[PDB]
Design a protein around this nucleic acid. Structure first.
Length: 100
DNA sequence: GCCGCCCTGGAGAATCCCGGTGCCGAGGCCGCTCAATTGGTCGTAGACAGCTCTAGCAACCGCTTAAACGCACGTACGCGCTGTCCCCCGCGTTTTAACCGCCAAGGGGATTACTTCCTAGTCTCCAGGCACGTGTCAGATATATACATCC
């Protein structure tokens, strides 16, 4: 219960300016390893993983999600909005050719 | 005469600066060592020349006709404004699991060296499949001619 609450949006701009400067991975390593192993046991059983393989998968997945979020933000801005919605992701993936 | 209180001076300890010496990152030097270099030989890939036949190109023609263009009207939709409500954001508090540091043994896989043998490259010879051209043949199409019929 303290005064001087911040306006909704300048904190998000601060995290935008912070996370666009830094280069570290934004997803924790152990949940991503568990997700990769859970996906990979469907294709083949008794699969071992190098740590650099999981790191390459994490780098590629984070780059893909960041680029998709940039296209999604462009979709949301084009619809005279500032909030991203699942239809923006759907339109971005449709124009990209993933849903086409 | 005896005892208590205020003012001022020089010596002991803390700190800054400089010199001698030991440790981390990087570069010169040395040793192995394997792949780039050099030299020679030879086969053939490609450059060059030559002839033949077909497509493209610049600039013009003529004719047709459907597409393009201009204009007027009208109305549907993009856009701006306002309300509203709801849902996402900011923040405080509590939980929880990521992260790092640990076993405990065992298998997977990357190398180094070695052996062996099966299979694919290479060469020679041959023949049949593919590409092209043509004679022939059965299905599809159009009309010639004869019969039943309405006015």
């Amino acid at each position: 219960k303290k005064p001087h609450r911040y306006r909704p949006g300048t904190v998000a701009l601060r995290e935008i300016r912070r996370y666009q400067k830094s280069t570290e991975l934004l997803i924790r390593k152990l949940p991503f390893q568990r997700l990769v192993r859970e996906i990979a046991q469907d294709f083949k059983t008794d699969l071992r993983f190098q740590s650099s393989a999981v790191m390459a998968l994490q780098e590629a997945s984070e780059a893909y999600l960041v680029a998709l979020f940039e296209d999604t933000n462009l979709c949301a801005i084009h619809a005279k909005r500032v909030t991203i919605m699942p239809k923006d992701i759907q339109l971005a993936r449709r124009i990209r050719g993933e849903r086409a």
